[PDB]
From Swiss-Prot, chain B:
Changing residue 4 to S: In strain: Omicron/BA.1. Changing residue 1 to N: Reduced host ACE2-binding affinity in vitro. This is Spike protein S1. Residues 27-49 are annotated as: Disordered. Attaches the virion to the cell membrane by interacting with host receptor, initiating the infection. The major receptor is host ACE2. When S2/S2' has been cleaved, binding to the receptor triggers direct fusion at the cell membrane. When S2/S2' has not been cleaved, binding to the receptor results in internalization of the virus by endocytosis using host TFRC and GRM2 and leading to fusion of the virion membrane with the host endosomal membrane. Alternatively, may use NRP1/NRP2 and integrin as entry receptors. Binds to host ACE2. RBD also interacts with the N-linked glycan on 'Asn-90' of ACE2. Cleavage of S generates a polybasic C-terminal sequence on S1 that binds to host Neuropilin-1 (NRP1) and Neuropilin-2 (NRP2) receptors. Interacts with host integrin alpha-5/beta-1 (ITGA5:ITGB1) and with ACE2 in complex with integrin alpha-5/beta-1 (ITGA5:ITGB1). May interact via cytoplasmic c-terminus with M protein. May interact (via N-terminus) with host bilirubin and biliverdin, thereby preventing antibody binding to the SARS-CoV-2 spike NTD via an allosteric mechanism. The chain holds residues 493 to 541 of 1273 of the full protein.
Amino acid sequence: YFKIYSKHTPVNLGRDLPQGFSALEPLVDLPIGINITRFQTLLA
Amino acid sequence: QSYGFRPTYGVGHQPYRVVVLSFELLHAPATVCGPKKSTNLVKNKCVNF
Ligand SMILES: *[C@@H]1O[C@H](CO)[C@@H](O)[C@H](O)[C@H]1NC(C)=O
């Protein structure tokens, strides 16, 4: 049950990190059946 | 060796089309399952749901 959560807040002007309250909504609870210990980000 | 089919003779050597089904119950979340029946909807009565 690989859970991901996404939140898209563009209302920050942004210098390092905003100071405010926000929530995260569920997107999918799809299962993989194997544990994960490492990950990497794909960049174009 | 080829089968050597024929339409002019009776059973035994006739073409019998066969399809099989295979199932298993492993410790996994339920993904492939059958239908569940849906009933009507009623209001303003102390009923079950
Ligand atoms: C979790 O991952 C490790 C490797 O990082 C693996 O050896 C182990 O078998 C995994 N756990 C299960 C329950 O498969």
